[PDB]
Specification:
part of a larger assembly; 8 chains; A mainly alpha (103); B mainly alpha (78); C mainly alpha (97); D mainly alpha (95); A: 103 residues; Histone, subunit A; 2 strands; B: 78 residues; mainly alpha; elongated; DNA-binding; transcription/rna/dna; nucleosome; chromatin; transcription
Chain lengths: 103, 78, 97, 95, 93, 105, 97, 80
DNA sequence: CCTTGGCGGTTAAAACGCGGGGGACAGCGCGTACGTGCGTTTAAGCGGTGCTAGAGCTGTCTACGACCAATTGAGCGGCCTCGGCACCGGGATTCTGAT
DNA sequence: ATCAGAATCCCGGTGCCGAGGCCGCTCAATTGGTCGTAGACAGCTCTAGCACCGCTTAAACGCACGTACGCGCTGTCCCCCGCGTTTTAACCGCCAAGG
């Protein structure tokens, strides 16, 4: 395919189909879905990186979505992007207000 | 009716939300805000369903209705 | 014996910021959602997935609402919430016109 | 029996690259699929408005680049521009 | 150039509502931005519904349920009545 | 009636709407009654705002409607506040609004 | 030609400015502030004046909204003296950072 | 240089009075200047983004409007 | 094919009694933080004078995309086995209150 | 502090159940050639932005000064938080029907 012709894991043909069946413009350029595949793979690479660190946190091997939620919320910019999107089975951070702590 | 929303469940939501101690009238105020939000969501969902010309509320109508709210939810394939 | 106040409360805040399983359980919330939807069209059938999505969305939205409520109630030099905190926060977020 | 689609194998191979001793739940795979669909629709809409406010309809990769720098926060978008330009050069220099 | 606006149309609206009331240039610009905003909102929501039921064309029914989606109750009910009346009058005549 | 505006008896021209809907990237095909329906809804909304604009110009006895009148007319409605709350009009100002505890007892 | 108690000037300015329409921050320092932040992202720009007026309009809108929420927080806190922790609570609950 | 103090103390006072504030402290002013600065940072980042993709060495008001549409704080009145 | 719905049995969830104690509230001192004027000072802005980057229009030409037709090899439906993990019981620790 | 003692973490066990490896196959992405039209670009022109200048004039300033709201302290009073107890319904599991 064209995927290994740019060396990624995300297809170019499916994305090039979706850019026509979304009617996002008239025509679709040549290498633009390759660019988009690279952007998507870098994003999910950083996400699954911090997800793997979250998996290391509770000492599990298979990623549970709580690890996803904590990895999204801990980073600053990943809490900036995915702040307006809640996640099913997500939960929230371990958060205790120190002004509520007993003496 | 509305009184399936029991007092200690609202207390548990106050626990996860970060609240230590609770007043009394929080219960009625919570029921009111809950009812308003669910009304808006179910109205948009059944509007999607009535354009779908079908009798059963999908998951997808819920997902795109919360998309219309600016309250996008993942996990359910939207 | 008896503990002090704040022991059990903060202990359950610790114990309930870890499990993401839902708290408003299934059937009364389901009867409530069918009651709400009943006045839009007669006798609509339901998937379970829409009920699960609205249950998740409800508990998450009230978590965020309680966060802003508790930050108001502490900021006005109190420890315990009262419903005008909720009114203030909802006035901030632009739901009430 | 409509043949529905997902993204399980591609993201699964990316996970096996950067974390080989790491599993995944399928629920998380649905979450990530929803995530990529969201990111994709946002980038599509920004490319759309670029096409409208430029009085053209030929989407080059340059419009996708400026949409990437708009939608994402800064330094992550800087690395994203790096990844995208590198993939463009490696795909267009060879065939 | 031939930068097309909505000027004379809303002038005719204002003459057929308050027939002796003038209006400024920038207020007309505000109205122009208002109409373009509502146009893009309803057309975008209609395109979303076209994809959400995989129907590749646009009838009036999508527009009807789109204005059901955007506007809340009373104004929506009046707009549905107005649209159905104008559509039926264009239909039979 | 030659023009479809006359065939609809409306004033927002359905043909220019039809031209913008063809160059809109919205579906593949565009029906023949949908821009009629859309122009009717837009005419109803413009009338709904200009009504309150006329009332705002009448409350201050002013002839030409100014954008201050527009901003007051938008904030005086309840449903139009719920629609356009994340919209901010230039030259507007805000409501004449004084709180409770601010006045001297 | 006289002095009264503090507060009459305050309500007089509130009435005078809710009667008034136009800009409060003047033009030229705002222009030079925009050019200061603008040169730091790209060298040697040129500007339409209406663009800068639109920037001024958006700035005044954002500050007025922030002040409305700040005053609501203050009146909630049984205070009229606003303090920067009120703006902390406000830009917390709007979530815009 | 120092055009953040081009925002004057009576200007912050005037915008407090229009919004409805009665009692203005002294610690408010520079926090307000900082919030104004962060807002202008994000807005002019988007404006220069649309200007560079225009391949034009001039920023237009239309680009400012479109960037504000990308925010969620849409400004009418000036076209677009 | 998926949704409702009727029934039986249960255990955990809630409702309710109850006391006490600690948090909300009032009041008040007070006093120092800040509104108001006033000359004193700052500088905005409003109108003129030219200059010329560059926005924008016009043509062109070709170089890249839309599409046509065969194809094939990954992707997808299905099917199994396992070992990661929820949970069961023990022990140890780690908090907090009575002292 | 100081210890008693519940609460919670944590460690070995277990079985079981979705995750993932694997097989069969099919249709969508591939390849390649052909047309057409959009856009990159070169040149023009003339518009607006810019920099600068004179004068003015209305607006910002430092501080003196009064003063009033912010805040600390003390006292009150009953409202929830927490715990024993009784009631009770959500849930599990099965089992149809019918839309």
């Amino acid at each position: 395919t064209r995927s290994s012709r740019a060396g990624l894991q995300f297809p170019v043909g499916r994305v090039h189909r979706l850019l026509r069946k979304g009617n996002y413009s008239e025509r679709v350029g040549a290498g633009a879905p390759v660019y988009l595949a690279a952007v998507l793979e870098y994003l999910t690479a950083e996400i699954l990186e911090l997800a793997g660190n979250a998996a290391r946190d509770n000492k599990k091997t298979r990623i549970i979505p709580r690890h996803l939620q904590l990895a999204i919320r801990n980073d600053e910019e990943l809490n900036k992007l995915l702040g307006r999107v809640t996640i099913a089975q997500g939960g929230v951070l371990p958060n205790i207000q120190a002004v509520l702590l007993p003496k | 009716n509305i009184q399936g929303i029991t007092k200690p469940a609202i207390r548990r939501l106050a626990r996860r939300g970060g609240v230590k101690r609770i007043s009394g009238l929080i219960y009625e105020e919570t029921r009111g805000v809950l009812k308003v939000f669910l009304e808006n969501v179910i109205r948009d969902a059944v509007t999607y369903t009535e354009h779908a010309k079908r009798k059963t509320v999908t998951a997808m109508d819920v997902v795109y209705a919360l998309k219309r709210q600016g309250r996008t939810l993942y996990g359910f394939g939207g | 014996h008896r503990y002090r106040p704040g022991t059990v409360a903060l202990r359950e805040i610790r114990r309930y910021q870890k499990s993401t399983e839902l708290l408003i359980r299934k059937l009364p919330f389901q009867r409530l959602v069918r009651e709400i939807a009943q006045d839009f069209k007669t006798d609509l059938r339901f998937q379970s997935a829409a009920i699960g999505a609205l249950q998740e969305a409800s508990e998450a939205y009230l978590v965020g609402l309680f966060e802003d409520t508790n930050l108001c109630a502490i900021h006005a030099k109190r420890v315990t919430i009262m419903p005008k905190d909720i009114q203030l926060a909802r006035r901030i977020r632009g739901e009430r016109a | 029996r409509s043949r529905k689609e997902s993204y399980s194998i591609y993201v699964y191979k990316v996970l096996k690259q950067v974390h080989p001793d790491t599993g995944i739940s399928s629920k998380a795979m649905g979450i990530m699929n929803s995530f990529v669909n969201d990111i994709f629709e946002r980038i599509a809409g920004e490319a759309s408005r670029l096409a409208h406010y430029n009085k053209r309809s030929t989407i080059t990769s340059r419009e996708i680049q400026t949409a990437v720098r708009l939608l994402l926060p800064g330094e992550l978008a800087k690395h994203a521009v790096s990844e995208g330009t590198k993939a463009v050069t490696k795909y267009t220099s060879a065939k």
